């Protein structure tokens, strides 16, 4: 019933198109796409707080927290809105992305629309990595890619 | 105050940020900022139906146009929503965008978070050109930059 999408780029080579769709505004959100141009393995994949790509992906400010949560993995539940855990590359640097996700929305206060989704350099640690920055940001480094999330026909 | 962004992006380069803000969500919003790269003179300023940029600024699809009016100018009862008029290029190719907008919001129906904004190639004839594309698009010709408008700190 709602389908909103996300176009990722940044300054190297990561691009990827995301797609969410919600049937009911009580119900999960299915996220679908691809990112091309990662490293193999783990990145982390967040919605940051600010639709905001003025100076580039760090202009998106912290992970989107309207419950002032610290940091987790998606199926946790102390866990920022915006924590959708990592997507996997594979060999050939392509992430098939495929989630579903119970806290986001595209409707209310857990709404995404407008805020902005970022693909990371490392693996976010969910909150596991044993130092405080694991409990803010899972130390899953730089901003490879972002865009904002916008509505689709 | 509720405050919103958009980056515009295309080929050229054609860039610029464009800043909103409403005091309150029954008052009018202040549209400001700058883009480079135009030719001199008018350019057609539109938010578009969707935030879908995924094969650039033509996903956009058309003017945003919650009411189901006909194209006009600002100053028209008669227009869609995301009829933000002309922005105007000086001969260094830099439009200073300032604008008052009352039909716009960044609340309700009318909001305009998670649309499009998109700078065209030539003039909005406002709905007054006398042909049938007048009272669709104003005859602005093709998308010179987009981005999806997003929130702000
Ligand atoms: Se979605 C979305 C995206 C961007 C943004 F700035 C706002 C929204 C909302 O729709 N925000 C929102 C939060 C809480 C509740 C509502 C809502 O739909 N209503 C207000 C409460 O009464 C029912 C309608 C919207
Ligand atoms: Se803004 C925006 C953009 C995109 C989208 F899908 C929804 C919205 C809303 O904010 N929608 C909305 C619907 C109903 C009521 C409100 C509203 O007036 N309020 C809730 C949010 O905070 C202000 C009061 C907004
Ligand atoms: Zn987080
Ligand atoms: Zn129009």
Redesign the interface.
């Given at each position: 019933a709602t389908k909103?999408?996300c176009?990722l780029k940044g300054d190297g080579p990561v691009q990827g198109?995301i797609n969410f769709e919600q049937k009911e505004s009580n119900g999960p959100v299915k996220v679908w796409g691809s990112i091309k141009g990662l490293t193999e393995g783990l990145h982390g994949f967040h919605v940051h707080?600010?639709?905001?790509?003025?100076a580039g992906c760090t202009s998106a400010?912290p992970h989107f927290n309207p419950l002032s949560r610290k940091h987790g993995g998606p199926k946790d539940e102390e866990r920022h809105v915006g924590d959708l855990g990592n997507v996997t590359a594979d060999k050939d640097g392509v992430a098939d992305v495929s989630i579903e996700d119970s806290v986001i929305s595209l409707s209310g206060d857990h709404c995404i629309?407008?805020?902005?989704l970022v693909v990371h350099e490392k693996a976010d640690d969910l909150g596991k990595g044993g130092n405080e920055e694991s409990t803010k940001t899972g130390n899953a480094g730089s901003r490879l890619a972002c865009?904002?999330?916008?509505?689709?026909?």
């Open positions: 909103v999408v176009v198109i707080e600010f639709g905001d790509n003025t400010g629309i407008g805020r902005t865009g904002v999330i916008g509505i689709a026909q």
